[PDB]
Every structure is written in structure tokens, then in C-alpha cells.
């Protein structure tokens, strides 16, 4: 039901990198890490299924 130790440690690292009000040295805003390609996502409409499929095909390496 619960993730292993590596996952918990990584999750805590990720939370610390974002919650600088609890961790770190530099106090930025609540959800900022500091201190090209944009993914295309389907809108849930069957009409745009083909467009999303061909966009994903063009996303290939």
C-alpha cells in the first residue's frame, strides 16, 4: 500500500525543493523551485483524437 524507502526519500526531496518555507536557505514563494518543447495533451474530445495522435507521432525522436 505504501511506497518503498527510495520513493519516500525522493518524494521528501521533491517536497523540500518546493516548500522553501520549511526547508532550504532561500525563502521563495510557496511553489517555486528557484531559491523549447511543450507537451500537447488531449482535451477529451473524440473529434481531436486524430489530431492528438498525429501530434504524438510527430513527437517521436
Amino acid at each position: 500500500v505504501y511506497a518503498p524507502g527510495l520513493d519516500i526519500e525522493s518524494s521528501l526531496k521533491q517536497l523540500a525543493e518546493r516548500r522553501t518555507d520549511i526547508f532550504g536557505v532561500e525563502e521563495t514563494a510557496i511553489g517555486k523551485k528557484i531559491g523549447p518543447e511543450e507537451k500537447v495533451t488531449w482535451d477529451g474530445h473524440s473529434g481531436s483524437m486524430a489530431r492528438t495522435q498525429q501530434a504524438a507521432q510527430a513527437n517521436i525522436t
Partner: protein, 97 residues
Amino acid sequence: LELRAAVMHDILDMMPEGIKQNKARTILQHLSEAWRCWKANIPWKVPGLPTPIENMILRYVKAKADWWTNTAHYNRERIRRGATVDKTVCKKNLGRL
């Protein structure tokens, strides 16, 4: 919650997690058990727990207890004034009081 996370993070940073990853849930269970023991006002002493870890848990428990007392004595006084409060809030505050 943040407090717990912070403490947990600290331990996993100094725990050699590449060798002792399996002990994260053990540490969290120890934290919960210490908090429960303080809440129940019963003696708590893990015999095999390392002294620095015991100090970590003791300081975390002290901070959590101070927050818990302040929150209880703030919510109770808010409720006395006639403020609009939920139902689960009243039950939790009554338990704390």
C-alpha cells in the same frame, strides 16, 4: 504535517538510505508512536533507538506539542466567542481539551 515531513526529511538525509532505505517507515512509525505516547501522557523509551534519533524525535514531539496546545487553546476560545465552526473541528478540539 509539514513538521513531520521536515523531521522525516532530515533523517532520510543522514540515514544512509542506499543501505537503509527500508527504515523510512520504521522511523515514521517511531515518530507516530512517540506522539501517541506523549498524547496519552505515558512513558516512552525505545531502548535500541540511537541517542541522536531520540533527541530528534523528542524535539519534534516538543514542537508538535506546543503547536497542539496553542491550536487547542485558540480554537476553544474562537468557539466560545460564537464563531462559526464545523462539526469535526469541535470534536477534535474537544478531544484535545
